[PDB]
Write a protein that binds this ligand. Structure first.
Ligand SMILES: C[S@@+](CC[C@H](N)C(=O)[O-])C[C@H]1O[C@@H](n2cnc3c(N)ncnc32)[C@H](O)[C@@H]1O
Ligand SMILES: C[S@@+](CC[C@H](N)C(=O)[O-])C[C@H]1O[C@@H](n2cnc3c(N)ncnc32)[C@H](O)[C@@H]1O
Lengths: 239, 239
């Protein structure tokens, strides 16, 4: 069971994870609960203003402090004690599978989604526990990053359901038909030999990591078998 | 003008970008067009089967080849000549702002969204031009990655509308009120001095990059002004 509070100007976006696929089933079955608060609903002016001008000028707008702060405090009260508050931002800790495993240890999170140029620095200081980025690129809002985080952590919730699992890229996979545009399925996978198949998959994962993302292998303490299969793949490449 | 074809089992997820915010306005105004095809609609069996068992066993399922291949070919025909076909996968090129700028050079892309354990390796060989990842973590499907890519590239389309822009994290931003939980807005930003403000923002970007993501600075050819402001920030830190 995991509870995620979300602060967003566009809560309907979250239907993309709550209504579809494995995450949607997690939500319908109560394995994951996602509750949203919208800063617009905390405004008091006639036109429900949710942006504000940055001090110092420059182009762009910021989220208005009062509606956003009020929304955050409502979510914190709903979460009760022990909920970590995360702000999605490219200035935050870059998400990776280790970071996903750490976040999945939380039974409650509140995810704050910015729009426009972002949010006031002092709200980060006073209301946010951690800032997290989904990658070194800039999106229009924090909603896709928050949904990405939700989706990645939800995979760890028992009952909801490997690249980076053991630190390696996944092996190639094949299904019917046996021959596709003259390309055949590797016969080892048709052999029925479980141990040969296991080794092939592991060797492929090693080879693909080495060729595509060699920096990922630096970080790893390979097993003796992995060292051997990696050496075999590298010799085949040099042949 | 940019055209994006999407192949997905859950095309309704894309409402999250087509109906909301800056990307939603881009779609309504015809700056961005997003067209979806669903492999389910290309099935012929009574129960519209879209998954299939992997050769070699192991847990999990793959996308079924025939419906997915047929959907891809329909999208390719709709795109006409010159559309790059991308498969979203953690085995692909990790997206970053340089990669976003390169993808934004395409007037047409087709984005293939996998589910389950993925897709047959031979379809990658025969139908996919490039594989791209949004980060080193595993999600339940390619839809959030495809939407992330769409959102990031859409920011480059003229008329739709900085971290990583010049390679640096953004500076902190402040809006009303002047004092928030006893934290005051930096007086330079209230000074009205454009050149002082510009320098402060740049120095803050340098400082924040250095402290949070020092590896990003390695990659940069700093200007003389940036070298100076970075040195000032580092001396203030050592004081
Ligand atoms: C246009 S961005 C704000 C851009 C601002 N100039 C900056 O670089 O931080 C709008 C919202 O999307 C969130 N956002 C953009 N890219 C993100 C990313 N890669 N990871 C997490 N959140 C992101 C931001 O933190 C911000 O609240
Ligand atoms: C459960 S993942 C497939 C996992 C498979 N064992 C692997 O590691 O490649 C399901 C779909 O989501 C896409 N996906 C998962 N994480 C992604 C990421 N970080 N970037 C892009 N696509 C991703 C996949 O390529 C796949 O088609």
């Amino acid at each position: 069971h995991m509870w995620i509070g979300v602060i967003s100007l566009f809560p309907e976006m979250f239907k993309a994870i709550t209504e579809f696929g494995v995450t949607g089933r997690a939500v319908k079955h109560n394995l994951l609960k996602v509750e949203c608060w919208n800063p617009r609903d905390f405004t008091f002016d006639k036109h429900k203003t949710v942006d504000d001008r940055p001090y110092g000028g420059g182009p762009g707008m910021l989220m208005m402090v009062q509606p956003l702060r009020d929304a955050i405090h409502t979510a914190k009260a709903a979460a009760g004690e022990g909920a970590k508050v995360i702000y999605l931002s490219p200035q935050g800790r870059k998400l990776d599978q280790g970071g996903v495993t750490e976040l999945a240890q939380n039974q409650k999170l509140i995810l704050v989604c910015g729009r426009y140029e972002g949010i006031d620095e002092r709200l980060i200081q006073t209301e946010i526990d951690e800032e997290w980025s989904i990658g070194d690129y800039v999106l229009t809002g924090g909603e896709l990053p928050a949904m990405t985080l939700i989706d990645a952590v939800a995979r760890f919730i028992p009952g909801v359901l490997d690249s980076f699992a053991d630190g390696l890229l996944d092996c190639p996979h094949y299904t019917r038909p046996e021959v596709l545009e003259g390309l055949t399925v590797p016969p080892v996978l048709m052999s029925g030999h479980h141990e040969e198949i296991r080794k092939w998959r592991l060797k492929q994962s090693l080879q693909r990591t080495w060729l595509r993302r060699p920096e990922l292998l630096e970080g790893l303490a390979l097993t003796d078998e992995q060292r051997k299969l990696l050496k075999e793949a590298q010799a085949e490449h040099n042949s």
